[PDB]
């Protein structure tokens, strides 16, 4: 029997989902590209990049700042160029992000009012920016990555531009706060350049202002799909600028719209928590150009801020998110009839809490604030507030617990903790080397020495810099398209032996004293967890497909891995949530503990096992003795306090009312 | 008290017919009744036996002056209702009906009874007033 | 009413008619009696639930601005 400390005094709240954007244009005929990714905008300024392959695994996270958010997300995918992401922060600035480092590559002032909407054209060489002053700004991006130039200003008008959509590279369609849709001409070499050809007014609420929240263009039949505050969806003929059909469908605001590749299905969502399906599959409907409201579905407990769609030969995804802070995935073709998945609110790919076996200290760092609890029944011994706007990326605590290191992309700071009067006295140790150092990852060799991996992936040792040589990685087309895959994702230091894993599956053993790098493994799948066991002299690596690999540290693979990698229990294979944390068992070194967002597992590595829909089919390549329990969930963090003590840390808004009839 | 509780526990395990004698013992007090039910009645089998014994006795003589046999059933029902209805024995249901019927009369009897208490409290005071 | 009938019970017996002159008393009383059967049922269920449940940072605060100032 083995002690569990089930703790919920640690609270983390994800920021509300604000924007969603897929990296590639849907092509049903072609297979899913290896580089397909989904970007998620958060109300706390964090941008989350996820991979639809191997169920859904989060490749990289861009960290936000205080009083920051993402109101619009936009991708640019030019053939032969690195994938580019652009975001709007609710101000007069357009930010292009360095995906390699996760830092702002370029900040561009629109020279206009507060930005409300962002959109990119078909040729992917221009951006349209909707401003609070009613001005639409056209920005050229074809120059290169990090290159942003003012192209042209469409006519200033007095209504806020809430949304923007394009028609090829010729026209800009914008929904305005005066309940009025505006069409501007973007055709160069045309006397009507930037001219407002047609302007449509929606039905207006009698006792309230009317806002056109979302507008989408439909190439196949050449109409505009618009959703306003009144809950009505209107379909408009572009060439004549006339209303074709109206559907008073939603009882509340329609905030977002999306359509399928073939423009046969138009999907709407908003405050009423429902997703409405509009259909024109039937041939007579296509001949008559008449849409039909097939169905609706209630899947969210709160507002649906963002909706996005993707299709391919092996992918058919409808992804939704909003105030509920969780992702809901559905099949576009089978929205009414298909199954759905509700993603966990928190999936701890990056560990935001740590537990110190010595002193029994639990440390959590949220929003530049670090809280320390002691367990004997729990007391918050210390809480620390940091000045810098940038959020804390990582925190590392020494084995003794006296020295706490707080790492941010901007700076790294070290604070010594002294126990006085059942409370910890905090003193900031001054180290110029660390202060001007970016800290992507930071681990302790011992009470004094530390290994730090910079945002540029420069590994060095600081005694409280002894740089460590790293093997060069061959460039690949996928690496060119997605830069961060070649970057260091998991670093681990264990008894002077350091292991680094990249998103491309390259695993290397690093000897910290020798400061030399030796290759270990080259896996075909993204690595989600890494662990070093000194007793068995092996390193445990977990891929995105939840396969467990044990490599001898110099057979390349241990005999257990050779026998058990494909022979894992049904529970491990059936999991749709990937493993994110591994920790050893003090009582028995061979036993290892593995836990995910909603599950915990223990495997004995001295015993061989008995031989006996909503994700990409994965036809294409990714690039170019046993205990299992799900009773505890959702899991922030799991680890040992002592040989028989387990720490489990778990998570403990008004919404549109939709009554449930009961009889 | 402890001895009788152990004796009752042993009789429950042994299927002894002296369960009724143990239950009617005068050493029992209300807090002990709660304590025994909560801590010693952990098996559905024991719970059914105690209910069956109590129900049969009360059904036979619902007008017994001994408040103890009713005293047991009160908290046995109050504290173990969720477990009692979980019992699927057909005989247990039949005894409940028999007990339900045996009790059922009394409630019809009481409204007539109270008025006739009134006639007596009435007749006294005149007799006392006439005496005075 | 009880004392009125108790003391003058003998007088009331020697009255030609009682029901007609005391019709309101019987009707008024009869309504109250009908409450007793049901009302007992409520006390039982009310007693059932009654018995059931009846037996059943600033000090540690550290801030960097405040330390930096003094």
């Amino acid at each position: 029997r083995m002690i569990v400390h089930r703790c919920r005094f640690v609270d983390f709240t994800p920021a509300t989902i604000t924007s969603l954007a897929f990296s590639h244009k849907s092509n049903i005929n072609k297979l899913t590209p290896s580089d397909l990714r989904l970007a998620i905008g958060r109300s706390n300024g964090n941008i989350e990049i996820w991979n639809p392959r191997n169920n859904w695994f989060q490749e990289m996270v861009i960290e936000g700042g205080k009083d920051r958010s993402i109101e619009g997300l936009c991708w640019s995918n030019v053939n032969g160029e690195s994938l580019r992401l652009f975001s709007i922060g609710g101000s007069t600035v357009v930010t292009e992000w360095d995906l390699a480092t996760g830092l702002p590559l370029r900040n561009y002032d629109c020279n206009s009012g507060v930005i409300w909407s962002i959109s990119i054209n078909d040729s992917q060489d221009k951006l349209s920016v909707g401003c609070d002053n009613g001005t639409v700004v056209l920005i050229d991006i074809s120059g290169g990555p990090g290159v942003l130039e003012h192209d042209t200003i469409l006519m200033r008008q007095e209504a806020r531009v809430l949304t923007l959509a394009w028609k090829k590279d010729d026209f800009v369609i914008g929904g305005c706060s005066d309940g009025r849709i505006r069409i501007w001409s973007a055709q160069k070499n045309d006397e009507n350049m930037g001219r407002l050809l047609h302007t449509m007014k929606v039905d207006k609420a009698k006792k309230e202002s009317t806002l056109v929240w979302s507008v989408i263009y439909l190439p196949r039949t050449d109409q505009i799909a618009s959703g306003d505050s009144t809950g009505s969806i209107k379909f408009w003929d572009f060439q004549f600028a006339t209303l074709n059909q109206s559907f008073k469908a939603h009882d509340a605001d329609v905030l977002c719209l999306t359509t399928d590749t073939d423009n046969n299905y138009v999907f709407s969502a908003g405050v009423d928590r429902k997703i409405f399906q509009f259909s024109q599959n039937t041939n007579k409907s296509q001949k008559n150009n008449r849409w039909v409201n097939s169905s609706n579905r209630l899947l969210h407990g709160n507002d649906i801020r963002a909706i996005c769609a993707y299709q391919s030969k092996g992918a058919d995804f409808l992804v939704s998110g909003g105030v509920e802070k969780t992702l809901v995935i559905n099949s576009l073709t089978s929205f009414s009839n298909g199954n759905y998945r509700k993603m966990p609110t928190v999936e701890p790919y990056s560990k935001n809490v740590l537990v110190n076996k010595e002193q029994r200290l639990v440390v959590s760092w949220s929003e530049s604030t670090v809280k320390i609890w002691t367990m004997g029944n729990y007391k918050l011994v210390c809480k620390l507030t940091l000045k810098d706007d940038q959020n804390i990326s990582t925190c590392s605590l020494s084995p003794d617990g006296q020295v706490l290191v707080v790492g941010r992309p901007s700076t790294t700071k070290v604070f010594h903790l002294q126990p006085v009067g059942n409370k910890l006295k905090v003193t900031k140790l001054d180290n110029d080397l660390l202060l001007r150092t970016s800290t992507k990852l930071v681990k302790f060799i011992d009470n004094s020495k530390i290994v730090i991996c910079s945002c540029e992936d420069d590994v060095f040792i600081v005694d409280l810099p002894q740089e460590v040589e790293l093997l060069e990685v061959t460039s690949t087309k996928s690496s060119i398209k997605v830069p961060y895959i070649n970057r260091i994702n998991h670093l681990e230091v264990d008894q002077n032996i350091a292991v680094i894993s990249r998103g491309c599956g390259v695993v290397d053993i690093l000897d910290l004293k020798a400061r030399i790098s030796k290759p270990l493994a080259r896996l075909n799948n993204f690595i989600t967890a890494v662990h070093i066991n000194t007793s068995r002299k092996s390193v445990v690596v977990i891929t995105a497909d939840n396969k467990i690999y044990e490599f001898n540290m110099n057979s390349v693979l241990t005999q257990w891995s050779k026998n058990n990698t494909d022979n894992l229990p049904k529970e491990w294979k059936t999991l749709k949530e990937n493993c994110v944390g591994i920790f050893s068992d003090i009582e028995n070194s061979s036993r290892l503990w593995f836990w995910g967002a909603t599950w915990i597992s223990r495997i004995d590595f001295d015993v061989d096992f008995p031989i006996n829909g909503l994700t990409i089919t994965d036809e294409s390549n990714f690039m170019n003795h046993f205990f299992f329990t799900d009773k505890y969930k959702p899991l922030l963090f799991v680890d040992l306090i002592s040989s028989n003590e387990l720490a489990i840390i778990e998570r403990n808004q008004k919404a549109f009312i939709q009554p449930k009839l009961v009889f | 008290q402890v001895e009788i509780a152990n004796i009752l526990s042993s009789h429950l395990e042994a299927n002894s017919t002296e369960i009724l004698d143990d239950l009617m013992s005068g050493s029992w007090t209300e807090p002990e009744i709660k304590k025994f039910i909560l801590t010693k009645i952990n098996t559905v089998d024991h719970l059914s036996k105690i209910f069956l014994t109590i129900s049969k006795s009360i059904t036979q003589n619902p007008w017994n002056e001994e408040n103890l046999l009713p005293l047991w059933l009160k908290w046995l029902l109050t504290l173990k209702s969720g477990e009692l209805n979980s019992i699927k024995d057909k005989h247990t249901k039949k005894n409940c009906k028999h007990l339900k019927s045996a009790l059922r009369s009394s409630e019809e009897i009481l409204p007539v009874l109270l008025g006739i208490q009134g006639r007596l409290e009435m007749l006294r005071r005149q007799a006392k007033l006439r005496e005075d | 009413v009880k004392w009125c009938l108790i003391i003058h019970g003998g007088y009331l017996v020697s009255i030609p008619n009682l029901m007609s002159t005391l019709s309101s008393l019987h009707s008024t009383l009869k309504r109250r009696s009908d409450l007793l059967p049901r009302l007992l049922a409520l006390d039982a269920r009310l007693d059932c639930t009654i018995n059931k449940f009846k037996t059943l940072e600033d000090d540690v605060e550290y801030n960097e601005e405040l330390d930096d100032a003094g």
Binding site: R6, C7 | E107, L113 | L40
Partner: peptide, 29 residues
């Protein structure tokens, strides 16, 4: 005595008719 018994039997008839933030446990493996 009958009144007491009848009210009692009435009560018996009517009877017949009718997460923590932190938890501490010790689990088997």
């Amino acid at each position: 005595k009958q009144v007491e018994i009848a009210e009692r039997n009435t009560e018996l008839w009517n009877l017949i008719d009718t997460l923590p933030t932190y938890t501490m446990e010790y689990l088997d493996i």
